[PDB]
């Protein structure tokens, strides 16, 4: 629902999702063959499943086609400094794709907003929803559409008949955090196949032995996983399949 939904949020108030007490695989997110740009700093895109972190912070918002190059640490513009600042030690993983067939319509889609004016900079990883009229001079105006006070929030120009650099691109960033808490979301192993009556090697969560798997005639109680013998040797492991 964070990727495929009916609508998204703006950049001044974006959706914040936390992945806790769950597990996922980043292999399906790479072979989709549907993303336009894919940048993943801090770790390799193909070697981030073996090593895992504590928590995963994912934010979702919309951006134009010419602003996709602005999501990077080490530059100054108008959106990367007033809506979402990127720190120096930014090990995020940004994913972007083109889905102009859902967030665009005839007549002008101005559903989402953005911030253009701001007094000063902001600390990274901080949301700004202040709708106060930014003053450029030294005299107030009581919040009117006159002189020396302009509204910082402005509309968009999204249109499905545009080119390629001005289309609404669904951009998401997957950041990782290494805290004192143990790693919750990591990389799990799957079930490939089962072979028996041959000298093979298996790893049933408690040992890695090389041998054959013969059909036994004794049934174990439904609370054990392994089994020893007289000579104190684990030669009976229940298949969790």
């Amino acid at each position, epitope marked *: 629902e964070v990727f495929n939904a009916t609508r998204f*949020a703006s950049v001044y108030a974006w959706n*914040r999702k*936390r992945i806790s007490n769950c597990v996922a695989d980043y292999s399906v997110l790479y072979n989709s063959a549907s993303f336009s740009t894919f940048k993943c700093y801090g770790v390799s895109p193909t070697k981030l499943n073996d090593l895992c972190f504590t928590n995963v912070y994912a934010d979702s918002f919309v951006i134009r086609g010419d602003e996709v190059r602005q999501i990077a640490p080490g530059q100054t513009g108008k959106i990367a400094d007033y809506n979402y600042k990127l720190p120096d030690d930014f090990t995020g993983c940004v994913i972007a794709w083109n889905s102009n067939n859902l967030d665009s319509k005839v007549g002008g889609n101005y559903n989402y*907003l953005y911030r253009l004016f701001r007094k000063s900079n902001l600390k990274p990883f901080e949301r*700004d929803i202040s709708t106060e009229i930014y003053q450029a001079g030294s005299t107030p105006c009581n919040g009117v559409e006159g002189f020396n006070c302009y*509204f910082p*929030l402005q509309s968009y120009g999204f249109q499905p008949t545009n080119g390629v650099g001005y289309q609404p691109y669904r951009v998401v960033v997957l950041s990782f955090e290494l805290l004192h808490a143990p790693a919750t979301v990591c990389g799990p192993k799957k079930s490939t196949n089962l072979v028996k009556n041959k000298c093979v090697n298996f790893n049933f969560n408690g040992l890695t032995g090389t041998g054959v798997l013969t059909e036994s005639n004794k049934k174990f109680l439904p609370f054990q996983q392994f089994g020893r013998d007289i000579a104190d040797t684990t030669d009976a492991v229940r298949d969790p399949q």
Partner: antibody, heavy 123, light 111 residues
Framework: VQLVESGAEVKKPGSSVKVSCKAS????????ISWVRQAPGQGLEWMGG????????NYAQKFQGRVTITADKSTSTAYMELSSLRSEDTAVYYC?????????????????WGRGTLVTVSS | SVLTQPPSVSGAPGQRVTISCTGS?????????VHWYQQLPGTAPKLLIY???NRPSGVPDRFSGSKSGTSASLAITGLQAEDEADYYC???????????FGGGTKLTVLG
């Protein structure tokens, strides 16, 4: 400032309701205005919030496309239109005001509220 | 819906009464600030405390709000003759794309 609303109003089950939200003074054409309802029996819901400066609609995903909220800059008022009423619409609506700020959370707060409009529809 | 609250709590006129509400890890535990409101039966609700760190104008100091991880807290000291209302917890939810309130608890029991 103070926001005054209309009194009680009864309509038909399947017609359109026409209420308004008046503002006394200023500070209405600079901040966002939302509508919060309350029904005896359950919690409080939030339909959506409308900005008067840009005139952009922003509703929630739980409410379908059946309610339209407009804004006016000549007299600084807001109207609410809702057709195809049901037996659940028996509640009261409030004309609230939002004042954003800065911080790590940046959540929408309701500092200023309205009076209330009792909208009861039945047989 | 996503925010659950106890149906009713009990207290004594002079002791500390603490109320809280539990949600998910995407609306209150993600990092968003919480807002507590008071729904009096006969008037419109007003603002009591926002962000659990500031104090608005017109609200006493006896109200104390804090956020312990993924849950908020509200503690009061002394029960006066104006606490016959309901307490709701409001937080911005990302799955609902908007703000959602809580269940609501009743303080007054019987007199």
């Amino acid at each position: 400032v103070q926001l005054v609303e209309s009194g009680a109003e009864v309509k038909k089950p399947g017609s359109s309701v026409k209420v308004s939200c008046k503002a006394s003074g200023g500070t209405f054409s600079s901040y966002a205005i939302s509508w919060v309802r309350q029904a005896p029996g359950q919690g409080l819901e939030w339909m959506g919030g409308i900005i008067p400066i840009l005139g952009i609609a922003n509703y929630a995903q739980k409410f379908q496309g059946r309610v339209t909220i407009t804004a006016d800059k000549s007299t600084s008022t807001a109207y609410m239109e809702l057709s195809s009423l049901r037996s659940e619409d028996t509640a009261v609506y409030y004309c609230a005001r939002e004042n954003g700020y800065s911080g790590y959370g940046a959540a929408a707060n309701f500092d200023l509220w309205g009076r209330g409009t009792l909208v009861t529809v039945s047989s | 819906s996503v925010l659950t609250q106890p149906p009713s709590v009990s207290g004594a006129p002079g002791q500390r009464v603490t109320i809280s509400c539990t949600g998910s890890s995407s609306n209150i535990g993600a990092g968003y600030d919480v807002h507590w409101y008071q729904q009096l039966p006969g008037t419109a609700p007003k603002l009591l405390i926002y962000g659990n760190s500031n104090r608005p104008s017109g609200v006493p100091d006896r109200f104390s709000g804090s956020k312990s991880g993924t849950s908020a807290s509200l503690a009061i000291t002394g029960l006066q003759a104006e606490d016959e209302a309901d307490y709701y917890c409001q937080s911005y939810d990302s799955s609902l794309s908007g703000s959602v309130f809580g269940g609501g608890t009743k303080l007054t029991v019987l007199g």
